[PDB]
Design a protein around this ligand. Sequence first.
Ligand code: SYM
Ligand code: CL
Ligand code: ZN
Ligand code: ZN
Length: 256
Amino acid sequence: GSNRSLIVTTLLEEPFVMFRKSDRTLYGNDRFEGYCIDLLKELAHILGFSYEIRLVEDGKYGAQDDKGQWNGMVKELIDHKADLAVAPLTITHVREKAIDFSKPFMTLGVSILYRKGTPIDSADDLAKQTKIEYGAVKDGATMTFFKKSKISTFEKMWAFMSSKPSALVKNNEEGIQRTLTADYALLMESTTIEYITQRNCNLTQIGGLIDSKGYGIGTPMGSPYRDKITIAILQLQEEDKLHIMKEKWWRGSGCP
Ligand SMILES: C[C@H](C[C@H](N)C(=O)[O-])C(=O)O
Ligand SMILES: [Cl-]
Ligand SMILES: [Zn+2]
Ligand SMILES: [Zn+2]
């Protein structure tokens, strides 16, 4: 064991982690802002560590291939290339077999992003039909949810998605654009839907939450920092700081 700064793996995703806008050019950690950047700053202060933020090269959250090999931030942790993954990283039972998670700092569920004014009201309506395309981000928790479901409705939807080489999108930005340009609904985590629908009055959430889960800080399996981060998250919750941080970055814009 050594004393050194922690390496934090992450990726770009609004409003969690973004390149802050400046016209003096910025280096290192100073390049970044967002809810997860604030959370990291608070966790580092409480626990007393310095750190360096590195974007994950493949830009992916993490999913397993047919051989069982991981990619994205999960793989960085597995390979011990980072000490912490600080991102909107969904805690899943499958991922827990490969990495460790703090307790959640945010909770959420899968829901549906679609246009307003349609008669679609639930995931069942989407599995019912064919005119409206639907999908999710590739190599993500939401995709894995459908690929692994044993509920008929979601097995059907996975068959649909999986077979269309367009429905599984590279990231949230491309999914949002598809919703804006084609007859397409995005399966998407509810926190990000809240973020988008507060800023785009022509989009809405369709239905409620299809499941319930949390975002946690990821560590390599067995890391001593996992329980420390958990304790610090509980302190930030008790101090009201996770509340302030959410409302800081989910500020919202006027939608009549
Ligand atoms: C984009 C998002 C990624 C998700 N937060 C994950 O950790 O895999 C999703 O899958 O819906
Ligand atoms: Cl980087
Ligand atoms: Zn290690
Ligand atoms: Zn409040």
